Structure 1
Amino acid sequence: ELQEKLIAVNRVSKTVKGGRIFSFTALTVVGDGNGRVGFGYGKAREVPAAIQKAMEKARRNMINVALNNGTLQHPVKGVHTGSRVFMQPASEGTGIIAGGAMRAVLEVAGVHNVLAKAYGSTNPINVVRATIDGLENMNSPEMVAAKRGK
């Protein structure tokens, strides 16, 4: 049920007095298959060290996303840093058809149908979080019955 996966890994540099020392950072997103979306970045001097902290941080900071059946309740716009993310429900249509960075967050959230097409900046670390912000701000037709109806 853990359903965890990595998006991408990127080598970086420091350049201290002695010379260049290269660290590694692996982005990861996790989910239970029905809502409960979460993610983690982290860093380390090794590849297996950095991925471990990413999956470790992905356990905490997990929030529910509301879905109808196996689809979104409505289309929702979301932005983060310099990235701009749109999505459409498209009920049982073709499905989970999207490029890397945003592929992980949709499939692990539970959606096997919605279309992405992420505009603006397509940076792996900025394109993620635009989903979680765009899925957190999304509200549910059953639980908006507080404002709706009466």
Structure 2
Amino acid sequence: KGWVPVTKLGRLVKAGKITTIEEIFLHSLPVKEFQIIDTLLPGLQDEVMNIKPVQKQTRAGQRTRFKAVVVVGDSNGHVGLGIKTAKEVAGAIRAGIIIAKLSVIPIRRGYWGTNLGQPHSLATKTTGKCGSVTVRLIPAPRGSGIVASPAVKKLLQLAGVEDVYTQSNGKTRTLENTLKAAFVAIGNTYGFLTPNLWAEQPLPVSPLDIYSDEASAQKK
């Protein structure tokens, strides 16, 4: 219990050196084991998209696989997408929560033509793409709600947005490609050099220089 800490980052978190979530994103850290973001943020909830029974032949008679597509998140700017074919309904359900805790990254979302108390829409028109699906998001005025396909809307809830103007294109009805494409589309709002992101960063320290005596690799 606790975490039985692996990979020098559980060794961070089991003591408590990293407090927030975005601290790990700030340094572009690797994440290998998965319950770190749920410890760091209990507000997430498990929101299933689809549990479909695939019976692919396991060489002697198929024993009923299941590929689950689970979008975990809180509706506050912390997302996650997990896709897995497994050997059990509940096994695929928990497996879809595993990968969706590896796949966490937030979205820079802002305002559109003014400013008031809280931000609502995105920053820029982006577009992700997965093979057969293109997803083209658009900033939106206040209040107008999510204009998207019935699979895209709940994922963009967990993006933390109140208003988007999605304009996807491609063979969307393969719903496996579509959420990969839209996850690329929301995983680019920081990865786009906009004129408000024109400052010169100082490139500050990594905490893997700081903590490395405090609570680090323990032989004992």
Query: TM-score category by the smaller chain?
Result: 0.7 to 0.9
C-alpha contact (below 8 Å) 1:93/1:114 kept by paired residues: no
1:60–1:18 distance in 2 versus 1, CA, 3 Å: closer
Equivalent pairs counted in the alignment come to 147
C-alpha contact (below 8 Å) 2:106/2:159 kept by paired residues: no
Runs of at least 4 residues off by over 4 Å:
140-143
Within the candidate set 181, 186, 197, 1:130 is matched to 181
C-alpha contact (below 8 Å) 1:9/1:27 kept by paired residues: yes
Q: Distance in 1 between matches of 2:103 and 2:62?
A: 34
TM-score, structure 1 as length reference: 0.84
Amino acid at match of 2:120: G
Within the candidate set 126, 130, 135, 1:80 is matched to 130
Q: Distance in 1 between matches of 2:95 and 2:70?
A: 10
Q: Does 1:67 align with 2:79?
A: no
How much does 1:17 deviate? 4.4
Which of the pair has the greater relative contact order for Cα pairs under 8 Å at 6+ separation?
1
The equivalent of 1:91 in structure 2 is 141
Q: Does 1:120 align with 2:173?
A: no
C-alpha contact (below 8 Å) 2:109/2:189 kept by paired residues: no
1:120–1:19 distance in 2 versus 1, CA, 3 Å: same
How much does 1:97 deviate? 3.4
Within the candidate set 27, 32, 36, 2:78 is matched to 36
C-alpha contact (below 8 Å) 2:141/2:163 kept by paired residues: yes
1:43 match: secondary structure: strand
2:92 match: secondary structure: helix
Larger Rg: 2
Amino acid at match of 2:167: K
Higher alpha-carbon deviation: 11-20 or 122-131: 11-20
Amino acid at match of 2:136: F
Q: Distance in 1 between matches of 2:134 and 2:187?
A: 15
How much does 1:143 deviate? 6.4
2:138 match: secondary structure: coil
How much does 1:128 deviate? 0.8
C-alpha contact (below 8 Å) 1:85/1:130 kept by paired residues: yes
How much does 1:67 deviate? 0.8
Q: What are structure 1's unaligned runs of at least 5 residues?
A: none
Aligned-residue identity in percent: 30
Within the candidate set 177, 197, 202, 1:144 is matched to 197
TM-score, structure 2 as length reference: 0.60
C-alpha contact (below 8 Å) 2:78/2:160 kept by paired residues: no
The equivalent of 2:8 in structure 1 is none
How much does 1:10 deviate? 1.7
